[PDB]
């Protein structure tokens, strides 16, 4: 069957912390008084949760509120520890308590506010040095998460928060979050379609920290290139035909080749052959201006399709691209 595969950074972390760490359904919750809370407006509702402005009225200050949909009691507590185990972090969103809604009788997550720029606004007015520093901020979250033991496993634009007045970046919705075991096999249905790893799309189950920086890699095509998304799949199995055109089909092959991969047959009447294009192929006139050598050869050692092969966070940090970026 499949070969295994361990991350190349981070192995051990969990199994040198203590059970409890790691443990989240062993993880007793200290709960908050939910009237320090007062509801403002509802600011969203996803598939998990509804998501609520908030004032701790105990201090004037500004909260955000997910109360969580009664459903999955194991992945709420998953959240939890993993916001606990990681709060203070550089640029990981601070879980500031955690109360039990008196309307939904479930948990409610509260999260310090974060006076985030409209994404479209981000993504269309970003300079060539913005998306550097951003990018290296991004970076700070990544590794340290990665460093933590923990992957992210949902890294994408909407789930990254950026105060553009502040120049303040924060990593949000861990509800995906993991904790890395060598030797786990994990469920391939994480992250959203257009920042799936290739990992996830062939069914390889025993991956680790580096599906987030292929995620973060997607992201940085999109932001350089001006094309969002960079791989605009029509569904999942699209989603890698959109990857093969630009990667390859041989190295993909080469891929499932090393790590024994059984390809589902569906994708032999539509990947087709492709060899890799190079990048300078998705140069234009209007993105001209936030490309460099530099920028290329970073996102070229994220989007690999063997995920032991990129870049880890710590080492996309030493990158030429980030040179230019103040420290
Ligand atoms: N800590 C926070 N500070 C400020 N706004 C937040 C915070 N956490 C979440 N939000 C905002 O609350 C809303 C949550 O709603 P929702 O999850 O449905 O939106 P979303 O960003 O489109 O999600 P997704 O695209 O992942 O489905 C979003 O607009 C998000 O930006
Ligand atoms: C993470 C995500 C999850 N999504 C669903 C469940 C549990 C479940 N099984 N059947 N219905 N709900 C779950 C657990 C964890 Br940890
Ligand atoms: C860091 C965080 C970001 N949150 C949203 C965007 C916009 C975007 N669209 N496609 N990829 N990114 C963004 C850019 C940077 Br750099």
Same mark, same amino acid.
């Given at each position: 069957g499949p070969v295994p595969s361990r991350a190349?950074?981070?192995?051990?972390?969990?199994?040198?912390?203590?059970?409890?760490?790691?443990?989240?359904?062993?993880?007793?919750?200290?709960?908050?008084?939910?009237?320090?809370?007062?509801?403002?407006?509802?600011?969203?509702?996803?598939?998990?949760?509804?998501?609520?402005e908030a004032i701790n009225i105990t201090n004037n200050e500004k909260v955000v509120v997910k109360i969580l949909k009664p459903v999955a009691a194991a992945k709420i507590k998953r959240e939890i520890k993993i916001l606990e185990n990681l709060r203070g972090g550089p640029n990981i969103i601070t879980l500031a308590d955690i109360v039990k809604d008196p309307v939904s009788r479930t948990p409610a997550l509260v999260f310090e506010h974060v006076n985030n720029t409209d994404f479209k606004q981000l993504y269309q007015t970003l300079t060539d040095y913005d998306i550097r520093?951003?990018? !290296?901020?991004?970076?700070?979250?990544?590794?340290?998460?990665? /460093?933590? +033991?923990? %992957?992210?496993?949902?890294?994408?634009p909407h789930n990254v928060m950026i105060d553009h007045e502040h120049?303040?970046?924060?990593?949000?919705?861990?509800?995906?979050?993991?904790?890395?075991?060598?030797?786990?096999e994990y469920n391939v249905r994480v992250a959203s379609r257009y920042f799936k790893g290739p990992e996830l799309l062939?069914? !390889?189950?025993?991956?680790?920290?580096?599906?987030?920086?292929? /995620?973060? +890699?997607? %992201?940085?095509?999109?932001?350089?290139?001006?094309?969002?998304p960079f791989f605009h799949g029509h569904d999942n199995y699209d989603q890698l035909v959109r990857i093969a055109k630009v990667l390859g089909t041989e190295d993909l092959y080469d891929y499932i080749d090393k790590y024994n991969?059984?390809?589902?047959?569906?994708?032999?009447?539509?990947?087709?052959?492709?060899?890799?294009?190079?990048?300078?192929?998705f140069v234009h006139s209007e993105n001209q201006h936030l490309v460099s050598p530099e920028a290329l050869d970073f996102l070229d050692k994220l989007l690999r399709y063997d995920h032991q092969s990129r870049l880890t966070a710590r080492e996309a940090m030493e990158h030429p691209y980030f040179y230019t970026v103040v420290k």
């Open positions: 190349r950074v981070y192995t051990d972390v969990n199994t040198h912390r203590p059970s409890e760490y790691w443990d989240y359904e062993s993880h007793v919750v200290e709960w908050g008084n939910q009237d320090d809370y007062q509801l403002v407006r509802k600011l969203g509702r996803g598939k998990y949760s509804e998501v609520f520093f951003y990018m !290296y901020e991004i970076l700070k979250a990544l590794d340290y998460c990665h /460093s933590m +033991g923990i %992957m992210h496993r949902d890294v994408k120049r303040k970046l924060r990593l949000i919705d861990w509800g995906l979050a993991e904790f890395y075991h060598p030797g786990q062939v069914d !390889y189950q025993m991956y680790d920290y580096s599906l987030d920086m292929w /995620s973060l +890699g997607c %992201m940085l095509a999109s932001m350089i290139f001006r094309k969002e991969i059984e390809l589902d047959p569906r994708f032999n009447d539509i990947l087709g052959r492709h060899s890799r294009k190079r990048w300078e192929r």
